[PDB]
Amino acid sequence: MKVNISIFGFGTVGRALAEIIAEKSRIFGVELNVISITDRSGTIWGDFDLLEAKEVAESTGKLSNIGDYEVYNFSPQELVEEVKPNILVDVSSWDEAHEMYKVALGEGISVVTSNKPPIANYYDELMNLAKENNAGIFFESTVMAGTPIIGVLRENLLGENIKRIDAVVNASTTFILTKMSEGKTLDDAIEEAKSLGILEEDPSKDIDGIDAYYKAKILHWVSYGEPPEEEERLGIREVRDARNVRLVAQVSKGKISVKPRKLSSDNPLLVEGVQNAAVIRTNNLGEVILKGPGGGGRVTASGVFTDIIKATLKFPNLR
Amino acid sequence: MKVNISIFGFGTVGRALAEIIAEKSRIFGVELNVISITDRSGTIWGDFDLLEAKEVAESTGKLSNIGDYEVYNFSPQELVEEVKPNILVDVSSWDEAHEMYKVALGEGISVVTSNKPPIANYYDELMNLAKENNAGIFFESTVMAGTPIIGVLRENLLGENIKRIDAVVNASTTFILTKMSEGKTLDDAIEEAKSLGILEEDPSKDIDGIDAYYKAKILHWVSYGEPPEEEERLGIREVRDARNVRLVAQVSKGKISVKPRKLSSDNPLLVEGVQNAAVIRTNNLGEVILKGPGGGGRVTASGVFTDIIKATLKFPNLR
Numbered sequence: 213m214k215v216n217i218s219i220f221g222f223g224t225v226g227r228a229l230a231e232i233i234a235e236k237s238r239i240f241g242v243e244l245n246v247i248s249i250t251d252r253s254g255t256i257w258g259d260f261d262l263l264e265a266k267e268v269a270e271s272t273g274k275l276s277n278i279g280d281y282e283v284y285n286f287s288p289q290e291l292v293e294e295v296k297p298n299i300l301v302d303v304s305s306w307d308e309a310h311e312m313y314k315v316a317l318g319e320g321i322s323v324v325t326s327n328k329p330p331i332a333n334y335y336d337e338l339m340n341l342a343k344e345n346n347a348g349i350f351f352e353s354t355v356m357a358g359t360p361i362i363g364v365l366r367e368n369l370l371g372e373n374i375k376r377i378d379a380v381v382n383a384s385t386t387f388i389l390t391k392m393s394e395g396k397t398l399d400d401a402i403e404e405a406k407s408l409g410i411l412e413e414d415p416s417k418d419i420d421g422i423d424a425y426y427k428a429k430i431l432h433w434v435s436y437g438e439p440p441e442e443e444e445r446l447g448i449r450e451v452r453d454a455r456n457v458r459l460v461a462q463v464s465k466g467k468i469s470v471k472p473r474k475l476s477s478d479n480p481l482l483v484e485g486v487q488n489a490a491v492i493r494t495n496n497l498g499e500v501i502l503k504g505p506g507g508g509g510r511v512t513a514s515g516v517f518t519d520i521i522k523a524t525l526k527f528p529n530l531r
Numbered sequence: 532m533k534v535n536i537s538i539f540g541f542g543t544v545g546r547a548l549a550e551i552i553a554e555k556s557r558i559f560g561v562e563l564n565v566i567s568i569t570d571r572s573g574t575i576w577g578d579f580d581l582l583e584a585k586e587v588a589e590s591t592g593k594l595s596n597i598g599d600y601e602v603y604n605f606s607p608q609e610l611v612e613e614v615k616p617n618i619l620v621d622v623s624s625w626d627e628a629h630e631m632y633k634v635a636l637g638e639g640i641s642v643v644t645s646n647k648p649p650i651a652n653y654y655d656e657l658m659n660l661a662k663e664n665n666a667g668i669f670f671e672s673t674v675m676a677g678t679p680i681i682g683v684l685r686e687n688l689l690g691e692n693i694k695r696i697d698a699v700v701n702a703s704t705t706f707i708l709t710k711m712s713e714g715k716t717l718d719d720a721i722e723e724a725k726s727l728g729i730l731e732e733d734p735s736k737d738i739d740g741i742d743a744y745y746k747a748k749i750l751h752w753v754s755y756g757e758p759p760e761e762e763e764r765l766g767i768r769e770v771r772d773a774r775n776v777r778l779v780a781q782v783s784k785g786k787i788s789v790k791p792r793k794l795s796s797d798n799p800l801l802v803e804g805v806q807n808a809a810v811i812r813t814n815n816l817g818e819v820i821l822k823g824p825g826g827g828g829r830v831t832a833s834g835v836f837t838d839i840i841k842a843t844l845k846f847p848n849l850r
């Protein structure tokens with residue numbers, strides 16, 4: 213069977229995804245065909261070579277330069293309405309992308325994304341809409357990227373009661389905390405990280421706990437099927453003694469709390485360097501621990517590719 | 532969506548499964564209906580209360596002792612043919628149950644199991660049969676029990692090439708090796724383990740690496756879709772220095788090797804207690820680490836329940 217895929221967004225994650233798809237376009241009795249790609253500059257739509265498009269975007273930073281394919285100025289809504297892919301893959305930084313998803317799901321087009329806010333903020337509407345149009349929504353790389361914590365929660369532990377999830381999901385903050393442990397001030401450590409590309413020049417999504425908050429919210433959705441009643445979002449700006457501290461996202465029924473935690477040397481949450489980690493507590497299993505990378509092009513595109521296959525094959529969305 | 536389930540075997544695992552099915556009989560749009568339970572004493576079949584049957588077997592030791600249901604003495608083939616369930620659940624210690632699986636699958640009856648040898652030895656025949664009869668096969672609790680290593684490998688990482696897997700999958704051997712580490716002889720360590728509940732009167736399959744080898748073989752099937760060419764099995768009996776040693780299953784394309792390995796102090800495979808672990812190495816993610824309990828009744832039944840749901844909902848088997 214053949215499936216048509218519109219990729220929406222084409223930055224680090226989207227370009228890595230094109231590689232993965234190109235290397236594995238025929239797999240699991242499926243053929244993956246990318247019929248469109250979109251960035252801010254525009255949309256290409258037709259018979260283009262996927263790695264060729266990646267190359268030209270890699271050098272030039274836009275889809276315009278492609279030889280002999282020509283650009284279309286579609287709105288998100290037009291792109292879906294006109295291209296009519298079977299699968300819409302959002303790998304963009306467009307926070308307000310839920311409106312585009314609504315349209316796609318209306319036409320029974322499944323959505324795959326790595327873009328958090330639409331899932332964190334509109335999870336319920338999007339799920340209902342999906343079920344109503346014999347379609348699916350997939351978001352694995354919205355949490356710990358390619359490391360399959362969403363698979364584990366969504367499609368497994370199906371007889372468990374999840375009492376708690378704790379997770380360290382920002383490598384940058386483990387870096388900052390480690391430097392502080394070694395005697396640097398927070399502000400120095402931040403300066404080091406920004407100059408290293410570990411942090412952005414606006415570091416708030418890491419330092420103020422916002423990325424983790426969105427990830428806690430998504431986890432809360434999957435595990436409990438409703439928005440939380442209680443929210444506590446904090447970052448690391450108040451940390452003084454940073455020994456054995458990590459920025460931890462904790463999820464329990466009706467509660468999300470992102471904040472710094474001092475951890476025993478024993479704790480698998482006490483991750484080193486760039487490693488992310490999640491400890492899931494259940495009634496029958498005690499702790500299940502999952503660790504892996506939390507970012508990177510190929511790492512993130514890995515999750516999305518898993519989701520493309522599931523969408524194509526219409527895997528049930530149970531949670 | 533109502534589903535009819537035959538449970539084959541009723542020991543620690545099957546009795547704990549009963550508990551779980553009773554508390555969660557309606558979930559995810561499914562009504563789970565248990566129509567037959569079978570042990571060596573024979574087979575009950577009908578309108579019987581699930582927890583009651585658990586209760587009589589609990590105390591008495593057999594199934595025959597129930598009220599208002601004649602026990603039938605059915606062979607495995609007769610059980611499938613006469614009961615006609617939608618899903619056959621094997622939680623027995625019968626090494627040769629694959630022949631029964633072949634029957635069910637032939638009738639489009641899906642199979643869920645925690646029983647290792649049939650999957651280790653007949654996985655391809657079983658997958659081909661299931662495919663030809665619009666049926667599935669699920670075996671999560673054959674490796675690390677409820678700890679969902681199978682879900683992770685089988686239904687996720689779908690864009691990955693699995694470079695390797697290292698795993699410690701026998702809590703019993705951890706205990707033994709730890710005790711040898713502290714000065715105890717093999718035999719004294721074994722006797723302590725028995726007294727603790729940690730080993731059976733025949734520990735041989737765990738001690739000699741046959742269990743792990745079965746497990747390694749299952750992981751190899753999931754990851755590469757064929758048997759290995761190189762096979763090495765070595766148990767713990769003859770370890771002279773057990774310091775920081777575990778019984779590690781190593782899996783790579785074409786290759787399985789179970790043997791005691793000395794590990795660094797920070798190695799995640801350096802597990803304690805009941806805990807099992809798998810370190811999965813893939814081309815895009817590097818290391819994914821999954822840990823959790825490896826045995827126990829409710830732990831093992833958790834994985835089987837997950838599989839029951841997926842069989843009922845016709846989850847794809849991509850690997």
Ligand SMILES: NC(=O)C1=CN([C@@H]2O[C@H](COP(=O)(O)OP(=O)(O)OC[C@H]3O[C@@H](n4cnc5c(N)ncnc54)[C@H](OP(=O)(O)O)[C@@H]3O)[C@@H](O)[C@H]2O)C=CC1
Pocket residue numbers: 220221222223224225226250251252253303304305306326327328353354357506507508509512
């Ligand atoms: N990098 C990582 O490790 C991870 C990233 N993610 C998430 O995946 C998404 C992509 O990440 P990443 O690839 O690093 O980000 P990049 O900034 O590298 O790429 C973002 C892409 O989206 C495009 N875009 C942004 N807004 C719009 C819009 N309104 N319409 C059309 N296109 C738009 C960008 O266009 P332009 O360049 O033209 O502005 C660019 O092509 C993000 O939401 C991120 O949070 C998730 C997990 C890991």
Ligand SMILES: NC(=O)C1=CN([C@@H]2O[C@H](COP(=O)(O)OP(=O)(O)OC[C@H]3O[C@@H](n4cnc5c(N)ncnc54)[C@H](OP(=O)(O)O)[C@@H]3O)[C@@H](O)[C@H]2O)C=CC1
Pocket residue numbers: 539540541542543544545569570571572622623624625645646647672673674675676825826827828831
């Ligand atoms: N417990 C654990 O931690 C784990 C177990 N498993 C596996 O799950 C399975 C169940 O283990 P568990 O419940 O602990 O073991 P038990 O020995 O407690 O139960 C085994 C069951 O199988 C029955 N049985 C064996 N052979 C036959 C047969 N030919 N016909 C009918 N019934 C039969 C037994 O009957 P009788 O008592 O009458 O002999 C018993 O009810 C095993 O294959 C085991 O390897 C896998 C992972 C973890």
Ligand SMILES: N[C@@H](CCO)C(=O)O
Pocket residue numbers: 354356357381382383384417418423506507508
């Ligand atoms: N490595 C990222 C996670 C990407 O979703 C961060 O914590 O900011």
Ligand SMILES: N[C@@H](CCO)C(=O)O
Pocket residue numbers: 700701702703704737742807825826
């Ligand atoms: N962890 C268990 C494995 C049972 O499948 C043991 O020690 O045998």
Ligand code: NA
Pocket residue numbers: 352353354355356357358359360361362515
């Ligand atoms: Na993920």
Ligand code: NA
Pocket residue numbers: 671672673674675676677678679680681834
């Ligand atoms: Na398992």
